[PDB]
Design goal:
homodimer, mainly alpha, Helix Hairpins, minor pseudopilin epsh fold, 3-stranded antiparallel sheet, 8 helices, 47% helix, binds manganese (II) ion, Superoxide dismutase (chain B), Mn/Fe_SOD_N_sf (chain B), oxidoreductase (chain B)
Chain lengths: 198, 197
């Protein structure tokens, strides 16, 4: 059975970029709900013993009776699990992926602008991703709890742009949330995901 | 062409069921954005001189170039235009539609139970609606800014269950938001929409 992972830091460690109250509710309620519903769905089946990464990567192969339940709640569990580890109070804009970004986009700023444009343009609930697509870096957004893994693209950075992730602090100002995000990116975790790619 | 309508009451009117901050931002930012984007999409096209009800009812016939934009922002403008009119500080649980709910569901409570259930079960962003479908009432939910008018079902009540509609006051507790909504339903507007059905 899947478990809610502890945050790698205190609920207020990401202030003033993400507020304590959001980290608490987002982790203890929203993510916890995804875990509950995922467990109910796969309870006493083959999937119960697989990694959430392998389940989401091979969604198309999940029994049709529960496929959507696993897509949404399995997606939720993986996405938020990645998100907690991708955030840090000790963000350093350096490493393997930062260097690769500087080469491909010309600057970290130019990449941040494209990511922020894509993230703001995602109408409704979803995520903005940096992915490795066949060795190349690409920015893509997905609806709901969908994950590029399912489409054979490895995600190495994700931003949750569901309104529950930003509304208490930023209300309608999603662009301001996206700007604050850069201050708490764990580029060490980004490098880790990139290096484990394919 | 399309204008942001004024609320028919003060930002504070629906307290303590819906907070003042949310009424102001939901209307002055979120709805206003739908209007801006809608005007941009239809500018210098047939749609500029049509009712929003017409456009959303005949969405499939919008040029494919701009259909998604009109769907999302035209939808936004209709759904919020309805929503502001479907709220009031002077809610009274009586009228044509309340009587018909009592007839069909056996009690207003039975209806509220189904509505709350559907509204709570809508994964992600969307709306929960009471519709007239071929002369009969039905509860349905839509994703994003989709409206049952497009499916040929007349909406007579709507609840916004996008997180921006409830997150400031209720956060994750969507069911508490849904429960509070009953205190501010404009059943006179529900009757007006049902009669014009
Ligand atoms: Mn989330
Ligand atoms: Mn809304």
């Amino acid at each position: 059975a899947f478990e809610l992972p502890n945050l790698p830091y205190g609920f207020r460690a990401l202030e003033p970029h993400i507020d304590q109250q959001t980290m608490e509710i987002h982790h203890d309620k929203h993510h916890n709900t995804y875990v509950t519903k995922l467990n109910a769905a796969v309870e006493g089946t083959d999937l119960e013993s697989k990694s959430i990464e392998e389940i989401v990567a091979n969604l198309d192969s999940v029994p049709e009776n529960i496929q959507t339940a696993v897509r949404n709640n399995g997606g939720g569990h993986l996405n938020h699990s990645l998100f907690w580890e991708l955030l840090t109070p000790n963000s350093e804009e350096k490493g393997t992926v930062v260097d690769k970004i500087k080469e491909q986009w010309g600057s970290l700023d130019a990449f941040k602008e494209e990511f922020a444009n894509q993230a703001a343009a995602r109408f409704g609930c979803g995520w903005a991703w940096l992915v490795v697509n066949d060795g190349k870096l690409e920015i893509v957004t997905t609806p709901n709890q969908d994950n590029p893994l399912t489409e054979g693209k490895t995600p190495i950075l994700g931003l949750d742009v569901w309104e529950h992730a930003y509304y208490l602090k930023y209300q309608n100002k999603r662009p301001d949330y996206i700007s604050a995000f850069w201050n708490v990116v764990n580029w060490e975790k980004v490098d880790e995901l990139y290096n484990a790619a394919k």
